[PDB]
Amino acid sequence: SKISEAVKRARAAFSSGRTRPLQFRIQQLEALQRLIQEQEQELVGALAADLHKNEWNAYYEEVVYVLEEIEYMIQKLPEWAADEPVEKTPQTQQDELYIHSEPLGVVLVIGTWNYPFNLTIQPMVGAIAAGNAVVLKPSELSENMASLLATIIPQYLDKDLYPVINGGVPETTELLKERFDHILYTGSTGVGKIIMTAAAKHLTPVTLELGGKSPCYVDKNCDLDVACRRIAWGKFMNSGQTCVAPDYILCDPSIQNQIVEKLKKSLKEFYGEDAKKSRDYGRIISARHFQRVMGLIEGQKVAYGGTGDAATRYIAPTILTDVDPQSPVMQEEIFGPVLPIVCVRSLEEAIQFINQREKPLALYMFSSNDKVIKKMIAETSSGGVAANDVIVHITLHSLPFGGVGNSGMGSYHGKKSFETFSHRRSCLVRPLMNDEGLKVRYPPSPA
Amino acid sequence: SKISEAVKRARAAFSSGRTRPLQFRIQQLEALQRLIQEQEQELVGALAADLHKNEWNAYYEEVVYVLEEIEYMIQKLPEWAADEPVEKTPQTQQDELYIHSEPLGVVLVIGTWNYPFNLTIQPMVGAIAAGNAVVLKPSELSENMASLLATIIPQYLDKDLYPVINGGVPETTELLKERFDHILYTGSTGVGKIIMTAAAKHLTPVTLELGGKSPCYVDKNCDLDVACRRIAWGKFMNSGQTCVAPDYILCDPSIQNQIVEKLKKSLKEFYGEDAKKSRDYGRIISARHFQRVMGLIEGQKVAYGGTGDAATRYIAPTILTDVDPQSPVMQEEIFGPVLPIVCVRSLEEAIQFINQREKPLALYMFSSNDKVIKKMIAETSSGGVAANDVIVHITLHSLPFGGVGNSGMGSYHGKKSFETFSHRRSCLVRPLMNDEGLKVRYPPSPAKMTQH
Ligand SMILES: *CCC(=O)c1ccccc1
Ligand SMILES: *CCC(=O)c1ccccc1
Ligand SMILES: [K+]
Numbered sequence: 001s002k003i004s005e006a007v008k009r010a011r012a013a014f015s016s017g018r019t020r021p022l023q024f025r026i027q028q029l030e031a032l033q034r035l036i037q038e039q040e041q042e043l044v045g046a047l048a049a050d051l052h053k054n055e056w057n058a059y060y061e062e063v064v065y066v067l068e069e070i071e072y073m074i075q076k077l078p079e080w081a082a083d084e085p086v087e088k089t090p091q092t093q094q095d096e097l098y099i100h101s102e103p104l105g106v107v108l109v110i111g112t113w114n115y116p117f118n119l120t121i122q123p124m125v126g127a128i129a130a131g132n133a134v135v136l137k138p139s140e141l142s143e144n145m146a147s148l149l150a151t152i153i154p155q156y157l158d159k160d161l162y163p164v165i166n167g168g169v170p171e172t173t174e175l176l177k178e179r180f181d182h183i184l185y186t187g188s189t190g191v192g193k194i195i196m197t198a199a200a201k202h203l204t205p206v207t208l209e210l211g212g213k214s215p216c217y218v219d220k221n222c223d224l225d226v227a228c229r230r231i232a233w234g235k236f237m238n239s240g241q242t243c244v245a246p247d248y249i250l251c252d253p254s255i256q257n258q259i260v261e262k263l264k265k266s267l268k269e270f271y272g273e274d275a276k277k278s279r280d281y282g283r284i285i286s287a288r289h290f291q292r293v294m295g296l297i298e299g300q301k302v303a304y305g306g307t308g309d310a311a312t313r314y315i316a317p318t319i320l321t322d323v324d325p326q327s328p329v330m331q332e333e334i335f336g337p338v339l340p341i342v343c344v345r346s347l348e349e350a351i352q353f354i355n356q357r358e359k360p361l362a363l364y365m366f367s368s369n370d371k372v373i374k375k376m377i378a379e380t381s382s383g384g385v386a387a388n389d390v391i392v393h394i395t396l397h398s399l400p401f402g403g404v405g406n407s408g409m410g411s412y413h414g415k416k417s418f419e420t421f422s423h424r425r426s427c428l429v430r431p432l433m434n435d436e437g438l439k440v441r442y443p444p445s446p447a
Numbered sequence: 448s449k450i451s452e453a454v455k456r457a458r459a460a461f462s463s464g465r466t467r468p469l470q471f472r473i474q475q476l477e478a479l480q481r482l483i484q485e486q487e488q489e490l491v492g493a494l495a496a497d498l499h500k501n502e503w504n505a506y507y508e509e510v511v512y513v514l515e516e517i518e519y520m521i522q523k524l525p526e527w528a529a530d531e532p533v534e535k536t537p538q539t540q541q542d543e544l545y546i547h548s549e550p551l552g553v554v555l556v557i558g559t560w561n562y563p564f565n566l567t568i569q570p571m572v573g574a575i576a577a578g579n580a581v582v583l584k585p586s587e588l589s590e591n592m593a594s595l596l597a598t599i600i601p602q603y604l605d606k607d608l609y610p611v612i613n614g615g616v617p618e619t620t621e622l623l624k625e626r627f628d629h630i631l632y633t634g635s636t637g638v639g640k641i642i643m644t645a646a647a648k649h650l651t652p653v654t655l656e657l658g659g660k661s662p663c664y665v666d667k668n669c670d671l672d673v674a675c676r677r678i679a680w681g682k683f684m685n686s687g688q689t690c691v692a693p694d695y696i697l698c699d700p701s702i703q704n705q706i707v708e709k710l711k712k713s714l715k716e717f718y719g720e721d722a723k724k725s726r727d728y729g730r731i732i733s734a735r736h737f738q739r740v741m742g743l744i745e746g747q748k749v750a751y752g753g754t755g756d757a758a759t760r761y762i763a764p765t766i767l768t769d770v771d772p773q774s775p776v777m778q779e780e781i782f783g784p785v786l787p788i789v790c791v792r793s794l795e796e797a798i799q800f801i802n803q804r805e806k807p808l809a810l811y812m813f814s815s816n817d818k819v820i821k822k823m824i825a826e827t828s829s830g831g832v833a834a835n836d837v838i839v840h841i842t843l844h845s846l847p848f849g850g851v852g853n854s855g856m857g858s859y860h861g862k863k864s865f866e867t868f869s870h871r872r873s874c875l876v877r878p879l880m881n882d883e884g885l886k887v888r889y890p891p892s893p894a895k896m897t898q899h
C-alpha cells in the first residue's frame with residue numbers, strides 16, 4: 001500500500017544513518033524555518049479557511065511557537081545530544097558513567113485540527129532534533145492545512161524521512177498497523193485509548209496529549225477586572241477550541257454577577273457588539289461540532305450570547321449562569337465559545353469538585369492570596385497549572401507540556417521534546433584490568 | 448472480590464491524604480528496612496527453596512540493592528519532592544515558574560520470579576517514596592517468596608495502602624481490570640503487550656521491563672583472562688536466570704577456543720569440577736523451564752557441560768561452539784546456564800548482527816580499544832550498556848535501568864524511580880495585577896501588519 005511503502009522508505013532512510021549527524025538535523029530544521037517564512041501567506045490562507053483565523057493570530061497564537069521551538073532547538077542541540085556524565089561512587093571512580101542519547105527510529109506524529117500547524121509541526125521539530133524519521137498524519141478535519149502540508153513538507157524536507165500521510169479515520173487506522181518507535185498523538189481521551197492499544201501491538205511508547213474540562217477557580221476577593229479579561233482572552237481565542245481553554249468557572253455565588261459583567265465588558269472590547277463581524281473571532285471547525293456546541297446551550301440560562309449561524313459555523317461568545325454540574329455542558333469538554341459558571345461555597349468545595357472529576361490537562365486559579373494558590377495546587381492533580389493567567393504556561397520552553405490521567409501521559413516542548421523522542425541509554429565503561437576490589441563478588445562465597 | 452476490595456481500600460487510603468507527608472513515606476521505608484533486617488533468615492530460606500540461593504548471594508546479589516535504594520531515597524526525598532524552579536524568560540521574570548511533583552495515586556507492581564525479592568520490593572520502594580499506594584502482585588513461580596511476602600509485608604507496612612495480591616495468571620488478569628495510576632511490570636516481551644493493552648483501558652502509564660537476548664561482543668585484541676571471568680560470573684549467576692545476563696557471545700573464530708578455555712577455567716574456580724556440589728550454583732525455577740532450557744542444548748556442539756538432572760532441576764554450566772544463529776538456542780532468550788558462541792568476522796558484522804535483531808535490554812562489549820567501544824555504542828541501540836563488565840550497570844543509583852523497543856519502555860532506580868511514580872506538573876504563578884505588556888495579545892489585533 002502507499003502507507004506501507006511510505007513507512008518502509010522512512011525506516012530505510014533512518015537505518016542508513018542519514019539523520020545521525022547533528023548537521024543533517026539542523027539542515028532539516030533550517031528548511032522548516034524557510035518553509036514558515038516562504039509559505040507565510042499560504043499558512044494564513046489555510047488557517048483562515050479552516051478555522052477563520054487571520055494573518056495576525058495565525059502567527060501570534062500558533063506559527064510563532066513553532067519558529068521559537070526551531071530556533072531554540074538548533075541552539076541547544078549540541079549540548080542536549082552530548083553524552084551526559086553522571087555521579088560516581090567510591091567503587092566506580094575509575095569508571096566512566098554516562099547517559100547516551102540516541103534516536104528511537106521512526107516516530108509517528110498524529111496531528112489534530114484546532115491548531116493544525118502547531119500541533120503537527122512543533123512535535124515534528126522535536127522528533128527531527130532527536131534524529132528520528134518522522135511520519136506525519138494531519139487531521140482531515142482541518143482540510144486546507146492538511147492539503148497544504150502534503151504539498152509543502154516534501155518541498156522543503158527530506159522526502160523519504162519525513163512523509164505526510166493523507167486521509168481520514170480509515171487511513172489513520174491503517175497507519176497504526178505499521179511499526180513505529182514512538183507515537184505522539186494529540187486529540188481526544190477516547191481516541192487516545194485506541195492509539196495506545198494499537199501501540200501495544202508493537203510495544204511502541206506513546207506521548208498522549210488528550211482532553212478534559214480545565215477548571216478555572218476564581219477567588220472571592222481578587223481583582224475581577226484583571227482576572228476576567230485574562231479568562232475571556234483564553235476562553236474565546238480560536239472560538240473556544242483550545243485544549244487548555246479555561247472550560248468552566250467555579251466561583252462563590254457572591255461574585256457571579258460581577259464575573260458576568262466583567263466578561264461581557266472584555267468580550268465587547270475584544271470583538272465588538274456583534275462578534276460575527278470581528279476579524280479576530282474564529283469559527284467552529286465542522287457542522288458536527290457546531291451542532292454539538294449549540295446543543296450544550298439548550299436548557300441553560302444565557303447571560304450573554306447564545307445564538308449561532310449554522311451556515312458559517314459562528315457561535316456568539318456565550319456565558320451561562322447557575323449551571324447544574326450534571327447538565328450536558330458540564331459533562332463533556334466544551335471546545336467552543338460557551339462559558340458556564342458553577343457556584344461553589346468555599347475553596348474546599350472547589351477542590352472537592354475538581355478532584356471528583358477526571359484529571360484535567362490544565363487547572364487555573366485566580367487569587368491574590370498565595371496560600372490559596374498553594375493549597376489548591378497541593379490538593380489537586382492536573383497536567384499543568386497557571387495561577388492568575390490562562391494558556392501561557394504551555395508556551396514556555398522551560399515548562400514541559402502534557403497531561404495526567406485522562407488528560408494524557410508524557411510531555412514535550414523544548415528540552416523535553418529532545419528527551420521524549422530519544423532513548424536515554426545508561427552506559428558503564430570499565431577498564432579491562434584486573435581489579436582486586438572486584439574479587440569479593442566471585443564464587444566461592446565466604447562462610 | 449478479594450482483588451476488588453484490596454484495590455478499593457488502597458484507593459480510599461490514598462484519597463485520605465495519609466501518604467502526602469514525607470514523614471509518613473520515610474516511616475514506611477524505614478519499616479521495609481526493619482523487615483529486611485528482622486526477616487533476613489526467612490528471606491534466605493525462601494530464596495533457597497525457590498532458586499537454590501544461599502545466605503551470601505541472597506544478600507549480595509539481591510537484597511542489598513533494595514537496602515541501598517531505601518537508604519538513598521530516604522536521604523534524598525525532601526530534595527526530590529521539593530517544587531523545582533525552572534528558567535525564566537524576559538516576559539516571565541516577575542512570575543514563578545516551577546515543576547511540582549505529586550503522586551499518581553495507586554500503583555501496581557507486578558513482580559517476576561528470578562529475583563523475586565528485588566523485583567517486587569525495589570520498584571515498591573520508589574513508588575512509596577513518591578507518595579503512592581502500592582499494590583503488589585508477586586510471581587507464583589517463586590512460590591516461597593510469594594507466600595512469605597504476603598505474610599510479612601502487612602506485618603511491617605500500612606495494611607490498606609500496600610496490599611499483596613496472591614495467585615497466578617487468572618488473578619493477575621482480574622487485577623488488571625482494576626483502575627491504577629501506573630503499572631510497573633517485569634517479565635516477558637509477550638506479556639508486556641498484554642499489560643500495555645490492559646493499561647490502555649484506563650490510560651494508565653506503564654513501565655515495562657521486558658526481555659531479549661543481551662549480546663556480548665568480545666574483541667580479538669582484548670585480555671581474554673579478565674574478560675571471560677567477568678562474563679562467566681554474569682552468565683552463570685542465578686543459574687543464568689538474569690534479565691541482563693550476557694545471553695550469547697559474538698567473537699572472531701580465531702579466539703573461540705581461548706574463550707572456551709578461559710570460561711571453563713573460571714567456571715571451575717567458581718563452582719568446582721562438579722557444579723552440582725557447589726552451594727553457590729543455582730537451580731532452574733520450574734519443570735517447565737528446565738525442559739525448555741535443556742531443549743536448547745539439542746543438536747548443538749557442546750564444548751563444556753551439556754547435561755542436567757530433571758529431579759533437582761540442575762543444569763550443568765554449558766558452553767556451545769560454532770552456533771547457528773538460526774538454531775533454537777539463538778532464537779529465544781535463554782534464561783539458563785547455556786552459553787552459545789556465535790562467530791563474526793569483524794566488529795562491523797557484530798553491529799549488523801545486533802541491529803538485525805530486537806533491541807536488547809543490555810548490550811555488552813569487551814575491548815581495550817576506546818574507538819571500538821564508542822562505535823558499537825554509536826551504531827546500536829539497547830536499554831543500557833556495559834563495556835568490560837556485565838550486570839553492574841543496573842546496580843548504580845545514577846544509571847536509570849530500563850529497556851528500549853522489545854526490551855521495554857520507561858525506567859527506574861534512584862531519582863528516576865521517584866520521577867517515574869510521580870506526575871511532574873508544570874506551574875506558572877503570576878501576580879494578579881495589571882501588566883501593560885500583556886495587552887499586545889488581546890484583540891483587536893493591529894489592522895496593519897508589521898515585520899516579524
Ligand atoms: C493543546 C495545545 C493547543 O491547543 C495550543 C497550541 C498552541 C498554542 C495554543 C494552544
Ligand atoms: C532484571 C533485573 C535483574 O534480574 C537483576 C536485579 C538485580 C541484580 C542483578 C540482576
Ligand atoms: K441554570
Ligand SMILES: [K+]
Pocket residue numbers: 439440441442443444445
Ligand atoms: K571470591
Ligand SMILES: [K+]
Pocket residue numbers: 526527528529530531
Ligand atoms: K525537586
Ligand SMILES: [K+]
Pocket residue numbers: 886887888889890891892
Ligand atoms: K491589544
